[PDB]
Amino acid sequence: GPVVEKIAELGKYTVGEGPHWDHETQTLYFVDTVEKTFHKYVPSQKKYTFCKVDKLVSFIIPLAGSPGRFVVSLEREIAILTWDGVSAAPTSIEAIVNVEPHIKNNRLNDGKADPLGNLWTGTMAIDAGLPIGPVTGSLYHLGADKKVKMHESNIAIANGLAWSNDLKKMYYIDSGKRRVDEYDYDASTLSISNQRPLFTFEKHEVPGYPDGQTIDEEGNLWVAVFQGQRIIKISTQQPEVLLDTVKIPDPQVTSVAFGGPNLDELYVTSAGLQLDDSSFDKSLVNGHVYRVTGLGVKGFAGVKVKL
């Protein structure tokens, strides 16, 4: 079976999230969605740093063509942070756009660049709840002239994103739906259509909620299962096919990104936040970062955002 290693050097996170592997610098970036912090891990040098802001954060993605700059979320704003990767605060902040200026209790959540470099990200109520809570989120992409376009409404908890290698499909998770959806993706118009369920947790006795996800070069999706103590591997060739399960010690698995020199080491974030309606006692809920090897697949380098 695959080897699941707890990364001792990284400690515990309230809600570690948003992992991004920069392949040229062999560096993992990630966030804590509650603690208002960004994080960097350089595994080959065992180097860890953090960066503090005063707004809720949910993703960190290098800006294409601009070393030392990152596209991030700050509450409902998409912004460029100039950060040296080591100081405990950014050097400067350049706001790009507020996606929801008049929705005072919403926030951005998961986000990722499509393979063409367009940032896609969605929102949620800050006080969203599972299985049932306020449903106030939408899915966006950031297009030309720094304006966002909306693609879907009625999202409870805007979560993991991936695209097929042929650029014909997008995959998307609202954790409240307890399923992964697939869509036809038109790369020329940057629009999605024909939404349909790909994989439905209840049909496979999978507990918990889908959270972040990523795709491998064979086209399999790797999905974090929050309150399921696992990642799952699912088909994109046939609907409703569970290919494998890998248990992760932390129950609240949050997200996934392939890394390492050969793109074959799966980094897995988790959450130590202890929630009142948990299926797991507090002693189990820690928030470590893990690395999974031996999966027999390779992923893709993290894509930078183009502005």
Number of residues that bind Mg ion (CB under 5 A): 4
* Under rule CB under 5 A, residue 100 binds Mg ion: no
Q: Which amino acid is at 84?
A: D
Mask of contacts with Mg ion, 106-125, x by CB under 5 A?
A: ----x---------------
Q: Is 184 annotated as a binding residue?
A: no
* Under rule CB under 5 A, residue 38 binds Hg ion: yes
Q: Which amino acid is at 105?
A: N
Which residue from 59, 54, 37, 50 is spatially nearest to 9, judged by alpha carbons? 50
211 catalytic per annotation: yes
* Under rule CB under 5 A, residue 63 binds Hg ion: no
| Residue 110 interface partner, choices Mg ion, Hg ion, none, CB cut-off 5-8 Å depending on type | Mg ion
* Choice between 30 and 172, CB closer to Hg ion: 30
- Residue keyed to tokens 């080959």: 44
Please give the residues from 188 up to 217 whose contact with Mg ion meets the rule CB under 5 A.
211-212
* Choice between 228 and 302, CB closer to Hg ion: 302
3-state secondary structure of 179: strand
* Under rule CB under 5 A, residue 51 binds Hg ion: yes
Q: Which residues are bridge partners to 72 per DSSP?
A: 60, 79
Which residue from 217, 243, 219 is spatially nearest to 231, judged by alpha carbons? 243
Q: Is 181 annotated as a binding residue?
A: no
Q: Which two tokens stand for residue 186?
A: 């038109």
* Choice between 90 and 260, CB closer to Hg ion: 90
User: Which residue's C-beta sits nearest to Mg ion?
Assistant: 211
| Residue 260 interface partner, choices Hg ion, Mg ion, none, CB cut-off 5-8 Å depending on type | none
> Of 37, 118, 136, 159, which one interacts with Mg ion (CB under 5 A)?
159
Count each helix (H run) and each strand (E run) in the chain, helices first.
Answer: 0, 24
Q: Are 181 and 194 a contacting pair, CB within 8 Å?
A: no
Please give the residues from 70 up to 99 whose contact with Hg ion meets the rule CB under 5 A.
70, 81, 83, 90
Q: Which of 211, 216, 250, 264 is catalytic?
A: 211
Neighbouring residues of 110: CB distance < 8 A, sequence distance ≥ 6: 17, 18, 58, 59, 121, 122, 158, 159, 160, 161, 173, 211, 212, 255
* Choice between 69 and 226, CB closer to Mg ion: 226
The Cα–Cα gap between 209 and 207 comes to 7
3-state secondary structure of 17: strand
Binding-site residue set for a divalent metal cation: 17, 159, 211
Residues at the site binding Hg ion, with contacts judged by CB under 5 A: 38, 51, 70, 81, 83, 90
Catalytic residues, which ones?
A: 211
